[PDB]
From Swiss-Prot:
This is Proteasome activator BLM10. Disulfide bonds: none annotated. Present with 2600 molecules/cell in log phase SD medium. The chain holds residues 73 to 330 of 2143 of the full protein. According to PubMed:12973301, colocalizes with nascent proteasome. According to PubMed:15778719, associates with proteasome core particles and also forms a complex with regulatory particle-core particle (RP-CP). The gene is BLM10.
Length: 198
């Protein structure tokens, strides 16, 4: 529990994550490359769909969606609980690497590495906009020794200029991704001289 998706919540969370894909593989792969679609994920088709050359059933697009939904509520709880330097391990309580299972590990650094492993598959540019928004403001966190290098590299991967010839910067510009330049400018201004050296 504690954020597990094993109820009717999973439907509404998939709908919120635009992960309520069409159940036909054929129609889904078509509406994955069509900008008029809710589930638009890429502008350019991979000419070699390397998963379709394997001699066994790879997992369903619905399984890849259901996995990403768990990674995202766990990443939300991890960041929204403010503990970005993940020192404080939690447990079962009195208050009243790549398998998703009943153990819940409230560390931002775990779930960003889960999401790095989900980047090998499609998700709609609407969910890519939410994720580019999250990793931008997360990478500017202060107070504690966060693993900043991998939060910058996650944003760099989310906004990529060349990913199977898709430019996600211009797809996110056409989606209306907007970022506050003042937070970035203020943090870069902390390297200007300050009038007390203490």
């Amino acid at each position: 529990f504690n954020g597990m998706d094993s109820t009717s919540l999973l439907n509404e969370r998939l709908q919120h994550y635009t992960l309520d894909y069409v159940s036909d593989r054929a129609q889904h792969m078509k509406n994955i490359y069509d900008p008029s679609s809710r589930w638009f994920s890429r502008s350019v088709r991979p000419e070699f769909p390397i998963e379709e050359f394997l001699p066994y059933k790879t997992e369903s697009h619905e399984d890849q969606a259901k996995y990403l939904c768990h990674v995202l509520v766990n990443l939300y709880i991890a960041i929204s609980s403010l503990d970005i330097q993940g020192l404080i391990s939690i447990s079962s309580k009195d208050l009243a690497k790549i398998t998703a299972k009943s153990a819940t590990i409230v560390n931002v650094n775990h779930w960003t590495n889960e999401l790095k492993n989900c980047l090998h598959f499609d998700f709609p540019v609407a969910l890519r906009k939410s994720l580019a928004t999250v990793y931008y403001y997360l990478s500017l966190v202060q107070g504690q020794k966060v693993y900043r290098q991998m939060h910058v590299d996650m944003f760099e991967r989310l906004v990529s200029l060349d990913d199977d010839r898709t430019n996600f910067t211009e797809l996110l510009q056409k989606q209306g991704l907007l970022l506050d330049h003042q937070i970035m400018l203020n943090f870069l201004c902390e390297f200007l001289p300050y009038p007390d050296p203490d």
